[PDB]
């Protein structure tokens, strides 16, 4: 039915995500950060974009709404390391949680939402939003499970008119990812499956 590329996408988006709040920056180099999570584990997260280069310094607190690149490890020194990519923002919370205006259209027909979570963070990395949206599409709307649901896009429109969008037939371009956005400044989020 589907082609090998769609199978890669399905595997990536069907899996969950790693979530850690109030993590602390242990080190910040070009393209990566070493973070100590409150539970003890270390997170070594890579940032392949010049447009999104985290400037948090040692000691600063961050939130991780990232995704793992490979299996976690137990090192000889008894440390537990996570290997993730992107998904680092500040710890600012919204006064009250808000539900983002998501509209899905499958083959032109409006498809209702199921289990769409409310958010409480002031800012979320675009990569985080990408998988939240895509995960909803894969688990509730069958995206990537059959050849008749393998294309489309999602578009986020900001209060000021600027838009962000990703092509649902390709993997998210981490390499050119823009900085996290204030979710309370989002006008609409549209997703369409071809």
From Swiss-Prot:
It comes from the Bacteria. Keywords: Secreted, Signal, Superantigen, Toxin, Virulence. It is found in: Secreted. Disulfide bonds: none annotated. GO terms for cellular component: extracellular region. One of its GO terms (molecular function) is toxin activity. Belongs to the staphylococcal/streptococcal toxin family. Responsible for the symptoms of toxic shock syndrome. This is Toxic shock syndrome toxin-1. The chain holds residues 41 to 234 of 234 of the full protein.
